[PDB]
Amino acid sequence: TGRPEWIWLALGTALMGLGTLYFLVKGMGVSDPDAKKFYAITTLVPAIAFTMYLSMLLGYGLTMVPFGGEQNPIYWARYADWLFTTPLLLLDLALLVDADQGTILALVGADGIMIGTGLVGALTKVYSYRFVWWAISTAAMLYILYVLFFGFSMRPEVASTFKVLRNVTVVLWSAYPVVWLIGSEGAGIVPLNIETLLFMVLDVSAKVGFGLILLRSRAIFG
Amino acid sequence: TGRPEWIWLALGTALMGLGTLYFLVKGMGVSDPDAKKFYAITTLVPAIAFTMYLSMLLGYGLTMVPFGGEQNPIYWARYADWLFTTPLLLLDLALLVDADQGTILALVGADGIMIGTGLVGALTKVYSYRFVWWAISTAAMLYILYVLFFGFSMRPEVASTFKVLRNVTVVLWSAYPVVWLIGSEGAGIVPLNIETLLFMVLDVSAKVGFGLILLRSRAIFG
Amino acid sequence: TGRPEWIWLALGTALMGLGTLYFLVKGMGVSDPDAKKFYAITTLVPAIAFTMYLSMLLGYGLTMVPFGGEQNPIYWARYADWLFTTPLLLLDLALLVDADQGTILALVGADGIMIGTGLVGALTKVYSYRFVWWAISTAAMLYILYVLFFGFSMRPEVASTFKVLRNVTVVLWSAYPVVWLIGSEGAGIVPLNIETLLFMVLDVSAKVGFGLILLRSRAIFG
Numbered sequence: 001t002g003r004p005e006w007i008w009l010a011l012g013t014a015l016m017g018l019g020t021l022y023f024l025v026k027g028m029g030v031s032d033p034d035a036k037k038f039y040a041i042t043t044l045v046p047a048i049a050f051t052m053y054l055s056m057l058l059g060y061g062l063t064m065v066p067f068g069g070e071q072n073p074i075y076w077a078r079y080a081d082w083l084f085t086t087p088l089l090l091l092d093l094a095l096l097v098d099a100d101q102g103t104i105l106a107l108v109g110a111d112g113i114m115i116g117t118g119l120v121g122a123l124t125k126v127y128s129y130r131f132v133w134w135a136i137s138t139a140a141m142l143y144i145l146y147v148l149f150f151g152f153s154m155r156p157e158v159a160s161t162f163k164v165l166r167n168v169t170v171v172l173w174s175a176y177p178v179v180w181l182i183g184s185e186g187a188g189i190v191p192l193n194i195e196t197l198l199f200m201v202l203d204v205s206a207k208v209g210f211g212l213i214l215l216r217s218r219a220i221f222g
Numbered sequence: 223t224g225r226p227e228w229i230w231l232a233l234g235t236a237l238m239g240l241g242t243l244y245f246l247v248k249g250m251g252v253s254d255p256d257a258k259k260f261y262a263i264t265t266l267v268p269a270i271a272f273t274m275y276l277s278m279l280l281g282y283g284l285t286m287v288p289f290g291g292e293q294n295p296i297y298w299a300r301y302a303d304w305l306f307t308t309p310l311l312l313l314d315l316a317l318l319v320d321a322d323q324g325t326i327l328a329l330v331g332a333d334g335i336m337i338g339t340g341l342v343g344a345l346t347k348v349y350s351y352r353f354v355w356w357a358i359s360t361a362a363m364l365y366i367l368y369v370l371f372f373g374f375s376m377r378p379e380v381a382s383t384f385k386v387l388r389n390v391t392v393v394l395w396s397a398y399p400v401v402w403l404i405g406s407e408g409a410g411i412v413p414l415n416i417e418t419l420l421f422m423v424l425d426v427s428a429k430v431g432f433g434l435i436l437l438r439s440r441a442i443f444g
Numbered sequence: 445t446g447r448p449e450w451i452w453l454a455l456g457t458a459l460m461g462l463g464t465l466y467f468l469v470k471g472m473g474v475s476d477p478d479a480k481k482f483y484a485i486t487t488l489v490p491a492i493a494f495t496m497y498l499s500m501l502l503g504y505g506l507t508m509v510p511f512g513g514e515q516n517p518i519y520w521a522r523y524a525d526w527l528f529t530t531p532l533l534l535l536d537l538a539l540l541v542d543a544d545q546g547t548i549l550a551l552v553g554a555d556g557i558m559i560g561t562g563l564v565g566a567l568t569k570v571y572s573y574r575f576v577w578w579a580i581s582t583a584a585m586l587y588i589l590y591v592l593f594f595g596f597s598m599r600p601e602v603a604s605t606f607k608v609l610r611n612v613t614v615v616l617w618s619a620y621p622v623v624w625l626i627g628s629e630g631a632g633i634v635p636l637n638i639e640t641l642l643f644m645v646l647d648v649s650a651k652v653g654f655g656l657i658l659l660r661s662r663a664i665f666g
């Protein structure tokens with residue numbers, strides 16, 4: 001449309017749709033209960049992202065937020081996506097290493113706090129307070145990354161695949177607070193069209209790339 | 223009140239309230255942990271529906287949505303109901319057959335996508351896009367119905383009761399997208415008062431009727 | 445600020461932040477999976493409350509609701525807090541006694557209904573209907589308290605700690621509907637600044653006080 005960022009919302013919609021259908025077909029037949037869990041979790045992630053990219057593409061998941069005396073276009077649908085897809089991504093990691101339930105609830109709850117405070121930050125109309133919420137969300141993110149590294153006798157197959165996905169997760173997820181800080185939600189240094197491109201590449205990599213690595217590994221089977 | 227549909231919201235409120243109290247009393251005493259699960263799940267469903275019917279009856283769960291150049295009365299509280307009650311109904315089915323956790327997460331997540339895209343469709347102000355969301359929600363519904371039929375050594379008691387509830391579920395749930403399509407959320411072929419009657423009969427049947435069948439079966443006991 | 449109640453939102457923010465960091469540090473090292481669960485649950489509660497107190501303090505979690513012909517300041521962020529923190533508090537109790545899953549789902553679902561109908565009551569613009577929602581929420585609360593007392597061979601260590609936390613829970617949680625009834629959400633007998641003080645003392649006691657009792661007990665270890 002008239003929104004220059006439309007092309008990246010359209011490409012992200014397509015890519016998440018295609019990833020969803022690929023993983024759907026791929027998991028057809030799988031009978032191992034353990035593998036079944038990883039396919040469900042991992043197919044659901046880009047399915048949810050597909051709907052929220054389409055909602056941005058059609059204009060539904062966009063609102064205007066007054067701050068710095070302007071009307072700032074804020075895509076809130078990203079936070080409805082991430083609210084469900086980032087704990088699912090963490091559950092994939094957690095199941096892979098057989099984490100303790102206490103550790104899984106710490107991770108999902110820290111993740112809820114990360115996304116919910118990012119959403120409050122995104123909708124806050126007092127510009128300086130936006131970055132108070134950024135900082136608290138960043139601190140929740142660093143707790144999560146801490147736990148993925150210092151909280152975890154795996155069969156060597158598990159260990160290997162987990163190490164790769166853990167490194168993929170730390171590098172990609174750490175970029176999100178930087179994009180938000182420099183982008184239209186934060187300091188406004190990078191235009192919305194380039195921010196939207198950055199988040200499209202991260203999201204597709206963190207969902208479809210991550211899941212291609214995982215669903216190719218024998219680590220997901222008993 | 224002045225809303226002609228008030229009578230059906232009032233009758234649905236009453237019927238869900240009465241079903242809730244019936245199942246509450248009925249489960250009193252039950253000590254079998256397995257049965258306890260089915261009573262909790264099955265009592266909670268019409269309890270939640272009671273609150274959301276009452277919220278429609280009092281006007282709280284109604285909003286106006288501009289589309290086709292008019293101010294369309296949209297009862298959004300139905301989606302807050304269904305968001306929680308339809309996965310609970312699916313958990314009742316899933317526990318009955320002892321489904322794999324992977325299969326249960328596929329079902330709840332597809333259900334979330336069904337209701338959340340129905341809600342976006344219900345609130346979308348570009349009329350043609352309303353039916354894009356309908357189609358995606360319908361596709362999620364057909365995945366769910368697919369899985370209830372082709373994804374599942376039960377004791378014969380389980381099998382029998384599950385087959386009846388599965389057929390009840392396919393027939394009733396399949397009517398919802400048709401009512402939405404022809405009703406005030408969609409093409410506007412059927413007036414809101416008759417739509418509200420249709421959804422009242424479906425909801426009471428899918429909640430209180432379904433639960434009367436289930437909570438009468440010995441299938442829920444170890 | 446100019447809101448007289450600011451001081452109690454500031455003190456509650458501080459106290460929940462300090463409790464969160466205390467329990468975070470305290471649980472460092474714990475390796476017992478059972479204890480790990482109680483630390484996760486119990487650290488998350490004041491972490492979530494911290495964010496929602498800060499959101500009230502900065503003005504984000506406050507809205508104006510017209511009722512009784514005025515513009516009533518309603519802090520809705522309390523309900524986003526309680527939606528997650530009160531089932532977590534109930535899970536702490538439930539895990540302590542090894543409750544049946546049926547019993548845990550009854551408790552979380554009744555809790556959802558308690559907070560969600562309190563939120564509808566808080567935002568309802570027809571003054572008399574506000575108290576219809578209060579009554580239904582109160583009835584959900586009495587079901588929960590009923591179950592904590594008449595629904596539950598514990599090692600004596602569990603029993604002892606559970607009895608203390610159960611009495612703490614009945615006394616503190618029972619005060620919330622009274623504060624709401626006499627406060628700005630209800631009859632408006634007590635000013636918002638004193639209501640906000642009452643809820644700060646209850647919340648800190650029900651979260652940080654409760655958790656100090658629990659995380660000091662050996663009951664949380666296998």
Ligand SMILES: CC(C)CCCCCCCCCCCC[C@H](C)CCCCCCCC(C)C
Pocket residue numbers: 015018019022201204205208209210212
């Ligand atoms: C059969 C396999 C390999 C998958 C192909 C199905 C299509 C869907 C997406 C899968 C590919 C993505 C790999 C993740 C990595 C990336 C960094 C994603 C960033 C996207 C940018 C565009 C580059 C090309 C693509 C259009 C595939």
Ligand SMILES: CC(C)CCCCCCCCCCCC[C@H](C)CCCCCCCC(C)C
Pocket residue numbers: 237240241244423426427430431432434
């Ligand atoms: C003891 C048993 C049988 C239950 C009676 C308690 C009351 C609550 C509801 C239970 C009855 C409903 C059966 C479900 C089937 C239907 C198709 C429901 C559609 C409702 C339409 C009105 C018909 C009559 C009723 C008011 C019972």
Ligand SMILES: CC(C)CCCCCCCCCCCC[C@H](C)CCCCCCCC(C)C
Pocket residue numbers: 459462463466645648649652653654656
């Ligand atoms: C090391 C221990 C004891 C904890 C201290 C860390 C600080 C955070 C909060 C812990 C203290 C609270 C106990 C709960 C009981 C109360 C009734 C809370 C009501 C608060 C009112 C103010 C009273 C003093 C306080 C500022 C500690």
Ligand SMILES: *C/C=C(C)/C=C/C=C(C)/C=C/C1=C(C)CCCC1(C)C
Pocket residue numbers: 082085086089114115117118119121133134137138139141173174176177180203206207
């Ligand atoms: C599928 C998409 C994924 C994996 C997205 C991850 C998003 C985050 C890690 C977001 C982090 C943020 C912060 C740490 C700071 C505040 C802003 C956020 C929400 C962008």
Ligand SMILES: *C/C=C(C)/C=C/C=C(C)/C=C/C1=C(C)CCCC1(C)C
Pocket residue numbers: 304307308311336337339340341343355356359360361363395396398399402425428429
């Ligand atoms: C308790 C009520 C139940 C069982 C309701 C079920 C609702 C559905 C199956 C709704 C389905 C819909 C679609 C498939 C298309 C879009 C509109 C919906 C949400 C009505």
Ligand SMILES: *C/C=C(C)/C=C/C=C(C)/C=C/C1=C(C)CCCC1(C)C
Pocket residue numbers: 526529530533558559561562563565577578581582583585617618620621624647650651
């Ligand atoms: C961390 C805070 C806790 C433990 C808060 C508990 C809140 C309740 C028990 C609230 C109860 C309410 C009712 C019973 C009636 C309606 C109003 C409420 C939501 C305040």
